Structure 1
């Protein structure tokens, strides 16, 4: 079973409002072999709450990280969107903060090592930390040194002893996956020198709310983060937020830079600005989260009826992509193999398997091209630009996409915009 949350991860208070509850839901990255029955498929409570002190949004429960990550199926995206963005991460970290060549970059949640490879090509030393043993072994084989463990205070000490003081510690879409964020901040403080930086990239709570990105809620994502809550945490561990860049990736994200409170790095005015913008946008008020809750109910209702109405007219519908978030979407909406006949996915591992809960088949893009699909529900919507750019033939044949946010809509639109 999953361990229930008591006190807030960031600020340590215990006062939260309920925002939305999806009940028991299977794990989003637990894909299954095709079978006759799925009676013993595990399901865990999926519900979110909002801490009134610092306004961290969090799940009510914490699924065991040993269960989630020790055999992880998701390798870092090989898309042009992520290749480009990884290059941009290097550029921002190096040029904005003046990190010299030959400097040491440690990455938490380094996965296959693609992001570290980009730092190596820019002239840096690297080391990765990732508990996914299968994925860690690939990174190591490829020449990118990765410790096959979770980040911790003692792993941080091992790194300092064996590899030294890093100029940069990086965590991309891992910080919201960790329960004991307090221990992460502590290991970071010990690791950082006076001008070292800790950088985390996470989905931005502001974008999540304004765009109704409820499908990004799943068990791996324990936290849903705004800048305010991060300041509340780092305050308590001798750390200080010095810079933030807003990013279009993964539905709107923030790349946050953190240094030692008594260190070289001055605080940029942008930090105060975003904290003021979060207040200004109603993040510290109960109404905003009840508004989010009904938006979700409306979108869920509208998405299901849109799909079932089209099917009733004799239209064929499939899913485009089989991302983790897609599985939250389809389970909450209650869609099945009768509504979507398959989900196409470029991930070889996922091909020939079946989605969690809904049990919809995952097929290859080359199979998908043989089938006369009328509509694709765009589950991998965070790659919307790249996907639409290469689906000209489908679109020219009268094919259409259904996008789930900010509001459900049909691509192509009825008119050109401009």
Structure 2
């Protein structure tokens, strides 16, 4: 039921090195009602391959986007970390490129519309595009105009006709979720004026490799992207990569700016620097990806044995957060409700549900606080700093966290960290 990849999404070649294969795995954002059995739970092959031409890393299969996104789960309350990062995105886009007030900003994958709201607060006109009908209706209700559609060449034309030429087109994380990136590039080209920019924020393949972030591999994430593969793609569609900012968010990301090849925006030197860096760090060599694969095997084994060793000693263990990536981690490690008695999560609709595959219960933070947990496995480790900042009481009582990457570790460490 999920379609197999043939040619490379970015460059069009067909020379794939196998990197890792996790077998059939259930969908990471498909949380389940508790039940006696889960025999009909859908599973899809989860494996990654590396294109030797441009070094896009890609999943072997594309799960149907209508199935994934047409009813996507959301939250109505964004954390201060998320709000701060959304404010920073605005600041970078507007200040780095001198976007005047009253300019038009189009966002692909605009979701609840919070990122657009931040652009409006900075004095911009906005429009969103997001296929999740449930989420789009919420955004529209709040006053953030949103087209309940997938981005395409045809939607691009409808936008230009009714809303004009955007000074900025933004895609936050969504770009790695789209199979037909060639169509996106074409719709963008049509939309862009001479000094318009297309900006995309995606997890950075360099960081993913170096920090062993294999839990970010899940079916929604079709692509795992470095600057090289984006240049290869945009070359073929009259677009030029003009600038890149590296960011610590989501385990290391890149915010990439793209313009018309013959437009006003000059290419900054950082672009070539990052491509040279990617070469230098071995992204074009088979050994690198074989090295990634064994790190994964090593971390997976070590993590499982740590949890089970602590359990055998009579320590109680739970998951902190129930993010999509947590479900890759737990499934790949083969952990069950005997290993983690629950996963706490602040997202209301998740509370009372059960995790895909492992079927571990999801409970509220307020339930979590009634329980004498000794260790929390930090599944939402990309928010480690914000989480640790508010878990003083737990830490003071001798509670500990297990961090899965770069290697498995225990917080707090045995000595003060100052080196």
SS state at 2:107 partner: strand
Deviation at 1:417, TM superposition (A): 2.6
**Maintained 8 Å contact 1:75/1:135:** no
1:164-188 residue CA offsets vs partner (Å, 9 max, x unmatched): 0000000000000000000000000
Alignment correspondent of 1:406: 406
**Maintained 8 Å contact 1:136/1:147:** yes
Please give the alpha-carbon distance, in whole angstroms, between the structure 1 residues aligned to 2:164 and 2:100: 16
SS state at 2:350 partner: coil
TM-score when scaled to structure 1? 0.99
1:236-282 residue CA offsets vs partner (Å, 9 max, x unmatched): 00000000000000000000000000000000000000000000000
Q: Name stretches of at least 5 consecutive residues in structure 1 with no aligned partner.
A: none
1:87-142 residue CA offsets vs partner (Å, 9 max, x unmatched): 00000000000000000000000000000000000000000000000000000000
TM-score when scaled to structure 2? 0.99
Please give the alpha-carbon distance, in whole angstroms, between the structure 2 residues aligned to 1:26 and 1:151: 26
Please give the alpha-carbon distance, in whole angstroms, between the structure 1 residues aligned to 2:307 and 2:233: 43
Please give the alpha-carbon distance, in whole angstroms, between the structure 1 residues aligned to 2:276 and 2:213: 22
**Maintained 8 Å contact 1:105/1:124:** yes
Please give the alpha-carbon distance, in whole angstroms, between the structure 2 residues aligned to 1:77 and 1:187: 31
Runs of 4+ in 1 over 6 A off after TM superposition: none
**Maintained 8 Å contact 1:240/1:259:** yes
What's the RMSD between the two structures over aligned residues?
0.7
**Maintained 8 Å contact 1:76/1:114:** no
1:6-41 residue CA offsets vs partner (Å, 9 max, x unmatched): 000000000010000000000000000001110000
1:338-362 residue CA offsets vs partner (Å, 9 max, x unmatched): 0000000000010000000000000
Please give the alpha-carbon distance, in whole angstroms, between the structure 1 residues aligned to 2:40 and 2:136: 29
Please give the alpha-carbon distance, in whole angstroms, between the structure 2 residues aligned to 1:346 and 1:67: 25
Deviation at 1:79, TM superposition (A): 1.6
Q: How many residues align?
A: 418
Deviation at 1:77, TM superposition (A): 6.8
**Maintained 8 Å contact 1:156/1:190:** yes
**Maintained 8 Å contact 1:18/1:50:** yes
Deviation at 1:74, TM superposition (A): 3.4
Please give the alpha-carbon distance, in whole angstroms, between the structure 1 residues aligned to 2:363 and 2:23: 28
Please give the alpha-carbon distance, in whole angstroms, between the structure 1 residues aligned to 2:418 and 2:403: 17
Alignment correspondent of 1:358: 358
1:360-384 residue CA offsets vs partner (Å, 9 max, x unmatched): 0000000000000000000000000
Please give the alpha-carbon distance, in whole angstroms, between the structure 1 residues aligned to 2:125 and 2:332: 44
SS state at 1:372 partner: coil
Please give the alpha-carbon distance, in whole angstroms, between the structure 2 residues aligned to 1:48 and 1:77: 33
